[PDB]
Automatic annotation (TrEMBL), chain A:
Name of protein: NADH dehydrogenase subunit 4L
UniProt family annotation: Belongs to the complex I subunit 4L family.
Keyword Translocase appears in the UniProt entry: no
GO CC entries: NADH dehydrogenase complex
Organism: Chlamydomonas reinhardtii
Top-level lineage group: Eukaryota
GO molecular function annotations of the record: oxidoreductase activity, acting on NAD(P)H; quinone binding
Keyword annotations of the record: Membrane, NADP, Plastoquinone, Quinone, Transmembrane, Transmembrane helix, Transport
Membrane-crossing residue ranges in chain numbering: 34-59, 65-90
Automatic annotation (TrEMBL), chain B:
GO molecular function: NADH dehydrogenase (ubiquinone) activity
Naturally occurring in which organism (per UniProt): Chlamydomonas reinhardtii (Chlamydomonas smithii)
Residues of the full protein shown: 132 to 279 of 279
Keyword Translocase: yes
Protein name (record): NADH-ubiquinone oxidoreductase chain 3
Location within or outside the cell: Membrane
From TrEMBL, chain H:
Gene Ontology molecular functions: oxidoreductase activity
Domain of life: Eukaryota
Role summary: Complex I functions in the transfer of electrons from NADH to the respiratory chain. Accessory subunit of the mitochondrial membrane respiratory chain NADH dehydrogenase (Complex I), that is believed not to be involved in catalysis.
Name of this chain's protein: NADH dehydrogenase [ubiquinone] 1 alpha subcomplex subunit 13
Keywords, alphabetical: Electron transport, Membrane, Mitochondrion, Mitochondrion inner membrane, Oxidoreductase, Respiratory chain, Transmembrane, Transmembrane helix, Transport, Ubiquinone
TrEMBL record, chain L:
Protein name listed in UniProt: Uncharacterized protein
Source species: Chlamydomonas reinhardtii (Chlamydomonas smithii)
Chain segments annotated as transmembrane: 5-24
Domain of life of the source: Eukaryota
Residues of the whole record sequence present: 2 to 55 of 64
Sorted UniProt keywords: Membrane, Transmembrane, Transmembrane helix
Length: 105, 134, 286, 387, 104, 65, 116, 71, 84, 157, 76, 54, 64
């Protein structure tokens, strides 16, 4: 009832949506630490970027690339800042918690 | 990849063309210009070679079991890695500008970007952030 | 066909890397008033072959207190990256081929880091990070140098790209300081003097050690080809051999720097110079 | 022609000059930066457009710059104000996202840096919590924005996808049950940064809503959440910080109620009154005036909080929004309990005020006593003024 | 259906010089037709005339100087439409087949 | 701009409200429009081309044999 | 369908900020340069620029007195206010030159032979 | 720049010819599709072949020969 | 040469000292400040463009084309004395 | 197109695996592989430049810092309830509802879309970046400065 | 906004421009009211973007093909 | 179990790669059927409109 | 250095033989000594059109 391109587009969209929700949920659901939370947020940004680029190719328009670059910039900046804050907290709270950095326990 | 519409095949009908594309030879001058395809096959071949070279000494070398044989004989990194992150993002920003025939106002805006960049970088310089005593 | 071309590229790479380490030994001897490897085969024309076969028959030892999968894969990953870089050098048509190879070289940092975390060695734990930081710092300057090069790479159609076949067949006399800084950055990328302070593979053995050295010298040859294409006005065996001869020349004459010293050097002398040169080239090329 | 875009170039040039000037001033062994503060105020004045909202936000920030003394935090506040001002000019979701994320990163950094004493650890923890939840909300916004970009193929902010844009806009104001991050921030961060947060991003978001936002839905259930939860929590929390946090939640619920029935004039005036009160709040040195804030929040007649809630009720009745109006009345009643509690805690007490020792003798008398003169405002307020 | 096609890219690039000098009116007519309408059905006569003129011009070249045109096209095909590297072949072809009529 | 807009009031009042985004795209790229050709023009052109085909000053439809 | 060939050597002459208007006054120069703007600047512009510069100098000297570094503070602050005011005045002059503000005094100034 | 300008001239000359050939072959493919549809939907009441979904502007097909996956 | 320079000291106490105290100037073993454009260009040629590595490089390269002292044991032996 | 679709499917597989495992090193390795394969699949969309940008940035810069932070901050705490405390059922149930059956998809009412390769123009990209979104480029510059200054001011000393 | 990635403009850019033209040229006090009179242009833009109706027609054609091949297997 | 980890990883990869396409195609089948029903309903609506509109 | 000179010549000869063999192999594969040239979507379109035209010619070749 459909062509191969329909297969590829549907697969792209479903995979991107599943990636989005997996990056949203799994880190907190599996009870990892803050570093994994930042990494999953990075994955969410990557999935949104993939969707944006797919849409831009679907339109042959330029907005998707601008969105891509801005998402990359913001995600990297926030991840670096969060890592710095996390290291500061690690040093500050080390003597009394050990399991400080896992707030999902 | 194989074409799935006559429009993709430039409205050329027939069965010979479909099978021809199915078992075609890779050609940069054919249907796959700028394909990046040999990278994957290179990855497969290198994986095979490295795995084989890992396996082989486990076959042609005598083995003896010893307890003691199975034993091994900072923020500056934070600063450097985060600076590398930001500066590589800035380099990625700069790269398209180098690939175009930009105009004078485009040049001035690029210089504005670079001015903000070097302003932050020089502030870090003047505050002792580039002296790696620690 | 494509696989056969990959193998035809592979064979000279391995043979010539063996010859490179042999000739580095021998030229170091020549500059040290000695002969070097000469008994192991006619004039010692068989040393690296027996060395590789010997490390092949040597016993691989695995620590029982870490993850051995990463221990195996890290030299494997580095070797894969070297092969991929060679393929992109010779078997590629990408519009940003130079950028492709730069991003590829950025990936080789992990193998040292993977090994450093893998084994339970404190000084490996430290030296892996030191080498990682050095190469990471110099990568920005290398990218800036490529940025400067890309300001004049144009094909006949008028599109600005990074294709190797469209590079001018003439040396770039107008970027000699850029060429010198790029050459020093290349020197830094390969852990060679005066940046041989970091080894990370101390607890490795056998063909793993062989593959580490293969990846090191293959990356050196890849960077040599990049430099020849960029500044020397073409890609040829003569230029590869000349650059290797000069690199052995520099290794045999200089001591190494201290860690924070080459950190300061790269972060206060090289990157700003590349930035200023990139700005100047962009301004003039307008 | 770029001749019409001079002021942005001026912004860039001034930022560069400020960077170099701050670098140079630090080599001299200087220890105070009031000159930098006044220069930053001047640069804020110059970069401001001629809109009433623009000038209001500008002056609000200008007064706020007296409460900080570190160059880097000044820079972060300048950049956050840039993001807010340009958010008042954001005609598309790309710039909207960029402004929100820049403001969020600036807020996180400002909260992290200025900590001192043993309170530092809790401030860091709260800041990291806010960063994580902000990152996930930002990802949600990006996801739904991309979906809208696919469906419309344009930059129009219309369609079913805008519901999530509305949700993300709610999250920035601490709209209950997406309120708890605000409570956590109220828990640890020093008073100056919380003083910033209660006024500027809320003002800019309300203005951008008023200028470039429409949707085909309601927010009434969230208004119920905010009102009821804030009222009950502010009644039940003995901690003053969390008390004011839940008070803020109730007030933002009231503002949302005003929003849902349109009539943004009352929204504007109530926001101004509440921002005035917050300005008076976080710079208090004498406790006798502290009850005036409560009576200006409890809707007691003679002062501005009462009239600010009053026209809101008037416009709610103008559309006969019986449900939310009754809910607002009941929550207003519940406010009075803890407001009287505040009055007891800081009116029927012995009078005592510590004297300054390192100079700076009561360094904020002027703004305090100026904000006190709100009892004289209702004279001009009672007429159709803000419209 | 009928098979309608034009010569290969190297041939088109090599003979493109003759297009303006001997197929100009149909060129301009097709230009205006495309600039006016978007439905291809409404430019059918112009498109068909352009294709017919192109093929007639190609047959004219092979009927007069096939070998020189052949080797110039081969040179262009080997170098990938880089006219800089086949200047001699271009000169010889234009000698054999002048773009405009000489001594008329 | 592509991400910002500024609103101001004409001191003279000779400005009519229109969609600023539509005006922005119009001044930025312009607009392209087409019309359907009249049929009689189609038969005239087809007949002229057919006559030129018959007469012999125009070629065939494929360069091959 | 078939794309247009790219024009690698022609960039659109586009400004990122668009006025979305047509000028309501006779046009002298749609694209004047910096020197053009300077040549026809009004005395009011210079007066406000000088006033801003002096105010900045005074304020900077006062505020730097606490840290005993008043002169360079005042100098830099005055230069800051001067460049701000100069940018504003040049923008207004360009706006007048482009027909978006009244230029009756200037239409008889930059047309030496089209004076009348 | 001289070489690129010459190539740009060449491509500007070329474009209408390839456009026309594309148009003719796409129209022929449309006619074949219409023939197939007429053969298929012969007995369907209320069906019409060649029905235009649009009103004013013609639409080109979504997929073309040029746009292919790289790897 | 054996002269010293500011920034070429390999430490922090000394580097921090010389960039914040002119004590090295009083030391005669530190190369004195350039005083004209010529001396500034000489200093730039000293620091940039190497010119220090170059000499040792050339000497090693001459050693490459130089003779060797290597002996082919066991087909050649060394020199020894009866007292061995 | 079996292998291309398999690579596409591998992305969400790795995404779930990232949170699934308990070793932080394994999570980071999974993320690196996911980033690489994502760029490679986007390369099938004709974005050569953007794929390299994503690769360069995330692999060389961000993942390196991830591994460094983990290695300087993480003694193995896997047995420290990371295996003995388990995972919240509500999270995985909600994730299933959200992503397996996707009651609220991006397309919404649409159920089929056609994916078509693009044509990335670095020339057009530069034109847009420096003529149409130059203001946003300067805003990104300001954001980069925000990141740098905030990081260097939040230094743990 | 409307700039093309590989071309100057988007592939459905003229249809968006047509819808915007229709919306702008009206005089109704409400965009929602103005939305009503230009439904056809919005629908044409929708079909340019997604080509839903052509997909539906082709699906119906294939449905009838399956009906004619399953329910009918007339042999020679 | 290094090799055990490899086996589990490869088994998961293969099972995913063979199973997810089935669910994707089930979604496609359901959407095609639903759209066919929608178009039939719209055709019936148009028929009724033609009948009662004259 | 007479001892290293054999290695010096061998390295150059090895690279020469490898490059010559790769040249011959890739020339046989691609059948034009310019395949490494930079190509845009325009040249890609021309190449793919030409390939499909050759396939169409072969299809029509087996019809007479």
């Amino acid at each position: 009832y459909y062509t191969e391109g329909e297969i590829f587009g549907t697969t792209f969209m479903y995979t991107t949506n599943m990636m989005f929700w997996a990056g949203i949920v799994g880190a907190v659901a599996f009870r990892r630490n803050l570093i994994i939370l930042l990494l999953s947020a990075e994955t969410v940004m990557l999935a949104c970027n993939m969707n944006f680029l797919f849409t831009a190719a679907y339109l042959n328009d330029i907005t998707g690339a601008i969105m891509s670059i801005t998402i990359t910039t913001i995600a990297a900046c926030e991840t670096a800042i969060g890592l710095a804050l996390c290291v500061a907290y690690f040093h500050m709270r080390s003597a009394t918690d050990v399991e400080a950095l896992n707030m999902l326990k | 990849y194989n074409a799935w519409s006559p429009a993709q095949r430039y409205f050329v009908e027939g069965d010979h063309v479909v099978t021809a594309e199915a078992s075609r030879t890779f050609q940069f001058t054919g249907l796959d210009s700028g394909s990046f395809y040999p990278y994957v096959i290179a990855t497969v071949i290198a994986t095979a070679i490295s795995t084989v070279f890992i396996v082989a000494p486990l076959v042609i070398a005598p083995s003896r079991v010893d307890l003691d044989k199975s034993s091994a004989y900072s923020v500056s990194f934070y600063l450097v890695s985060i600076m590398y992150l930001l500066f590589d993002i800035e380099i990625a920003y700069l790269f398209p500008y180098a690939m175009t025939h930009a105009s004078l106002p485009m040049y001035w805006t690029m210089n504005l970007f670079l001015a903000i960049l070097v302003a932050g970088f020089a502030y870090e310089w003047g505050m002792g952030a580039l002296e790696w005593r620690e | 066909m494509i696989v056969a071309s990959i193998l035809i590229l592979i064979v000279p790479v391995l043979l010539s890397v063996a010859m490179f380490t042999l000739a580095e030994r021998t030229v170091m001897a020549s500059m040290q008033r000695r002969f070097g490897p000469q008994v192991s085969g006619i004039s010692g024309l068989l040393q690296p072959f027996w060395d590789g076969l010997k490390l092949g028959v040597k016993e691989p030892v695995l620590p029982d207190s870490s993850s051995a999968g990463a221990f195996a894969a890290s030299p494997m990953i580095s070797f894969v990256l070297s092969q991929v870089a060679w393929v992109g050098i010779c078997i590629s048509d990408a519009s940003f081929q130079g950028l492709v190879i730069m991003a590829i070289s950025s990936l080789a940092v992990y193998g040292v880091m993977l090994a450093g975390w893998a084994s339970n060695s404190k000084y490996a734990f430290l030296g892996c990070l030191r080498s990682v930081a050095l190469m990471v710092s110099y990568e920005l300057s290398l990218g800036a140098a490529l940025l400067s090069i890309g300001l004049f790479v144009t094909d006949g159609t008028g599109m600005k790209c990074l294709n190797f076949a469209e590079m001018p067949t003439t040396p770039q006399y107008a970027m000699l300081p850029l060429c010198l800084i790029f050459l020093v950055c290349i020197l830094a990328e390969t852990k060679r003097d005066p940046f041989d302070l970091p080894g990370y593979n101390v607890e490795y053995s056998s063909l793993g050690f062989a593959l580490f050295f293969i990846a090191e010298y293959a990356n050196m040859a890849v960077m040599s080809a990049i430099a020849s294409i960029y500044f020397l006005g073409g890609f040829s065996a003569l230029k590869i051999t000349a650059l290797f001869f000069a690199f052995v020349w520099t290794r045999g004459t200089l001591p190494r720097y201290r860690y924070d010293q080459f950190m300061r050097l790269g972060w206060k002398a090289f990157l700003p110079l590349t930035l200023a040169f990139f700005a100047l080239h962009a301004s003039v090329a307008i | 022609x770029x001749x019409x875009x001079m002021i942005e170039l001026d912004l860039c040039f001034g930022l560069l000059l400020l960077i170099l000037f701050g670098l140079l001033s630090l080599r001299n062994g200087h220890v105070s930066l009031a000159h930098i503060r006044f220069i930053c105020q001047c640069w804020l004045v110059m970069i401001t457009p001629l809109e009433v909202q623009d000038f209001a936000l500008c002056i609000l920030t200008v007064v706020l710059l007296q409460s900080f003394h570190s160059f880097e935090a000044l820079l972060f506040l300048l950049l956050a104000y840039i993001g807010q001002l340009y958010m008042m000019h954001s005609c598309n979701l790309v710039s909207f996202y960029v402004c929100l994320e820049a403001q969020t990163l600036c807020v996180v950094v400002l909260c992290g840096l200025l900590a001192r004493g043993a309170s530092t650890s809790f401030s860091v923890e709260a800041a990291l919590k806010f960063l994580l939840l902000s990152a996930m909300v930002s990802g949600m916004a990006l996801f739904w924005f991309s979906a809208m970009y696919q469906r419309t193929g344009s930059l129009d902010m219309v369609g079913q996808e805008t519901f999530w844009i509305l949700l993300v806009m709610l999250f920035k104001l601490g709209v209950a049950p997406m309120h708890m991050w605000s409570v956590d921030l109220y828990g640890s961060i020093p008073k100056s940064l919380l003083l910033y947060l209660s006024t500027a991003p809320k003002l800019s978001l309300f203005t951008f809503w008023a200028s470039s936002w429409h949707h085909d839905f309601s927010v009434g259930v969230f208004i119920l959440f905010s009102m009821f939860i804030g009222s009950i929590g502010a009644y039940g929390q003995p901690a003053l910080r969390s008390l004011f946090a839940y008070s803020t939640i109730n007030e933002i619920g009231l503002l949302l109620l005003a929003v849902e029935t349109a009539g943004f004039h009352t929204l504007y005036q109530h926001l101004g009154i509440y921002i005035i009160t917050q300005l008076l709040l976080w710079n208090l040195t004498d406790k006798r005036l502290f009850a005036l804030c409560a009576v200006s929040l409890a809707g007691l007649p003679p002062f501005a909080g009462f009239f600010g809630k009053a026209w809101i009720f008037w416009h709610a009745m103008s559309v006969q929004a019986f449900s939310l109006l009754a809910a607002a009345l009941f929550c207003t009643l519940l406010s009075l309990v803890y407001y009287l509690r505040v009055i007891r805690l800081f009116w029927t007490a012995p009078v005592h005020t510590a004297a300054s020792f390192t100079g700076a003798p009561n360094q904020t008398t002027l703004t305090s006593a100026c904000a006190v003169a709100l009892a004289f405002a209702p004279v001009m307020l009672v007429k159709p003024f803000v419209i | 259906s009928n098979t309608v096609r034009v010569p290969y890219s190297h041939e088109l690039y090599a003979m493109s010089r003759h297009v303006v000098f001997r197929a100009e009116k149909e060129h301009k007519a097709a230009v205006e037709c495309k600039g006016k309408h978007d439905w291809p059905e409404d430019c059918k006569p112009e498109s068909e005339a352009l294709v017919r003129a192109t093929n007639k011009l190609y047959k004219e070249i092979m009927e007069k100087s096939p070998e020189e045109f052949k080797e110039y096209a081969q040179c262009l095909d080997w170098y990938g439409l880089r006219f800089s590297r086949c200047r001699d072949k271009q000169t010889a072809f234009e000698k054999a087949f002048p773009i405009v009529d000489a001594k008329k | 701009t592509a991400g910002f807009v500024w609103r101001e009031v004409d001191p003279t009042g000779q400005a009519k409200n229109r969609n600023h985004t539509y005006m922005y795209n119009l001044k930025t790229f312009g607009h392209r429009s087409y019309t359907r050709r009249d049929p009689s023009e189609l038969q005239a052109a087809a007949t002229s081309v057919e006559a030129r085909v018959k007469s012999g000053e125009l070629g065939g439809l494929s360069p091959l044999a | 369908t078939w794309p247009e060939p790219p024009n690698y050597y022609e960039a659109p002459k586009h400004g990122f900020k668009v006025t979305l208007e047509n000028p309501t006054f006779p046009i002298i120069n749609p694209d004047p340069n910096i020197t053009d703007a300077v040549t026809n600047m009004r005395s009011e512009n210079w007066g406000v620029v000088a006033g801003l510069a002096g105010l900045g100098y005074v304020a900077g000297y006062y505020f730097g007195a606490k840290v005993h570094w008043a002169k360079p503070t005042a100098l830099f602050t005055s230069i800051f206010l001067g460049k701000s005011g100069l940018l504003w005045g040049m923008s207004d002059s360009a706006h007048r030159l482009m027909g978006f503000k009244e230029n009756s005094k200037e239409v008889a100034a930059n047309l030496p032979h089209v004076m009348q | 720049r001289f070489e690129a300008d010459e190539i740009l001239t060449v491509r500007k000359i070329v474009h209408p010819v390839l456009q026309a050939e594309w148009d003719l072959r796409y129209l022929e493919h449309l006619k074949r599709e219409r023939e197939e549809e007429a053969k298929v939907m012969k007995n369907v009441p209320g069906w019409k072949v060649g029905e235009s979904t649009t009103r004013h502007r013609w639409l080109a097909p979504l997929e073309s020969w040029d746009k292919r996956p790289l790897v | 040469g054996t002269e010293r320079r500011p920034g070429e000291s390999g430490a922090w106490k000394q580097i921090e000292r010389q960039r914040y105290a002119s004590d090295w100037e009083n030391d005669p073993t530190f190369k004195r400040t350039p005083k004209n454009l010529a001396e500034v260009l000489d200093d730039s040629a000293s620091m940039l463009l190497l010119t220090d590595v170059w000499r040792g490089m050339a000497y090693t390269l001459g050693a490459f084309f130089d003779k060797k002292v290597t002996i082919m044991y066991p087909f050649e032996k060394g020199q020894l004395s009866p007292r061995f | 197109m079996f292998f291309e679709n398999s690579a596409i499917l591998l992305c969400a597989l790795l995404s779930i695996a990232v949170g699934y495992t308990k070793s932080p090193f394994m999570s980071l390795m999974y993320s690196v592989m996911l980033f690489i394969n994502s760029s490679f699949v986007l390369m099938m969309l004709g974005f050569e430049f953007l794929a390299l940008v994503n690769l360069l940035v995330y692999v060389g810069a961000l993942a390196v810092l991830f591994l460094f932070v983990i290695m300087l901050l993480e003694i193995p705490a896997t047995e420290l309830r990371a295996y003995s405390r388990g995972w919240s059922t509500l999270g995985i149930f909600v994730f299933i509802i959200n992503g397996v059956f996707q009651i609220t998809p991006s397309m919404g009412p649409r159920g089929i879309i056609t994916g078509l390769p693009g044509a990335e123009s670095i020339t057009n990209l530069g034109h847009a970046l420096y003529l149409y979104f130059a203001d946003l480029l300067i805003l990104n510059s300001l954001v980069l400065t925000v990141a740098l200054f905030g990081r260097f001011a939040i230094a743990p000393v | 906004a409307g700039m093309g990635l590989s071309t100057g403009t988007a592939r459905c850019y003229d249809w968006y421009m047509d819808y915007l033209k229709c919306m702008d040229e009206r005089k109704e006090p409400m965009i929602a009211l103005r939305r009503e009179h230009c439904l056809e242009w919005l629908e044409d833009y929708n079909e340019c973007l997604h080509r839903e109706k052509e997909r539906t027609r082709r699906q119906v054609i294939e449905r009838e093909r399956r009906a004619q091949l399953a329910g009918g297997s007339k042999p020679a | 179990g290094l090799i055990r980890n490899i086996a589990t990883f490869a088994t998961a990869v293969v099972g995913w790669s063979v199973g997810i396409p089935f669910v994707v195609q089930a979604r496609m089948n359901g959407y095609v059927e639903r759209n066919l029903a929608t178009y039939d309903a719209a055709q019936r609506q148009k028929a009724e409109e033609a009948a009662i509109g004259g | 250095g007479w001892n290293a000179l054999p290695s010096l010549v061998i390295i150059t000869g090895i690279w020469t033989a490898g490059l010559f063999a790769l040249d011959k192999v890739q020339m046989f594969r691609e059948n034009k000594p310019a395949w490494a040239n930079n190509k845009d979507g325009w040249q890609k379109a021309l190449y793919r059109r030409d390939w499909y035209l050759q396939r169409e010619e072969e299809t029509l070749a087996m019809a007479k």
